Amino acid sequence: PIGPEDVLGLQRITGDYLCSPEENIYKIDFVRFKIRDMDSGTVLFEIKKPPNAGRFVRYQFTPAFLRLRQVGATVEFTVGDKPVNNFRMIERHYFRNQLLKSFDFHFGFCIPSSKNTCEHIYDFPPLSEELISEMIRHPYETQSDSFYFVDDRLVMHNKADYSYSGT
Ligand SMILES: C/C=C(\C)CC/C=C(\C)CCC=C(C)C
């Protein structure tokens, strides 16, 4: 039902998850996530996996984050026995229902029944100063949808919100 063309034009965060966890028929499970700033080598965030059912994440960042040029994302995941072809993530970010950027990453070849490592390069959009001020000023109103497709079918959907106020 849901293909990449259904999400590629969205101008708002979705009101609900567009797929159920049962539709993840390929048993894809993300187990590690690490963010590196390509201009300082600084690790900006790193986690390792031990209602929303774990499909929502809250992120606490700093104001400097909104001026980064390029960020390297290291992602580790396991895969079931079904071979996976045309694995694709489409991740859209919004502040106050205004599209900031949409990232389209095609995964490399996925080895079934095994752990895989992939690297995504995030080229940040140049954000206007007024938009920078408002995202710092109103935490958690920057939101994202991450859509995962295998052979042009929605199989995973995650959500997140973001703070750029530090802690
Ligand atoms: C799976 C990854 C995430 C849930 C968050 C990582 C997203 C980014 C690093 C993009 C930041 C967007 C801007 C407009 C600055």
**Does ligand 1 come within 6 angstroms of the Cβ of 94?**
no
- Using the atom order of ligand 1, give the atom closest to the CA of residue 35: 9
Documented resolution in Å: 2.5
CA neighbor of 108 nearest in space, from 122, 118, 98: 118
Strand-pairing partners, residue 70, are 123
Experimental method: X-ray
> Does ligand 1 lie within 6 Å of residue 92's CB atom?
no
Nearest CA to ligand 1 atom 7: 122
Inter-CA distances, 113 with 27, 28, 88, 99, 150, Å: 9, 10, 18, 36, 16
The residue contributing the CA closest to ligand 1 atom 8 is 122
Nearest residue by C-alpha to atom 13 in ligand 1? 124
10 alpha-carbon distance from chain centroid: 15
In the chain, which residue ranges form alpha helices assigned H by DSSP?
Answer: 4-7, 129-137
* Token duo for residue 71: 């960020």
Asked if 23 and 155 count as a contact pair (C-beta separation under 8 A), the reply is yes
- Distance, CA of 165 to CA of 140 (rounded, Å): 10
Q: How far is 42 from 104, CA to CA, in rounded Å?
A: 24
Amino acid at 14: T
- The residue whose CA is least distant from atom 4 of ligand 1 is 160
Four-CA torsion 98, 24, 2, 52, nearest 10 degrees: -40
- The identity of residue 155, as a single letter, is V
Q: Contact at 8 Å (CB) between 52 and 90?
A: no
Q: Could you tell me which residues are beta bridge partners of residue 120? A: 73
131 lines ligand 1 (CB under 6 A): no
Residue in 93, 95, 127 to alter for ligand 1 test, most ligand atoms within 8 A of Cβ: 93
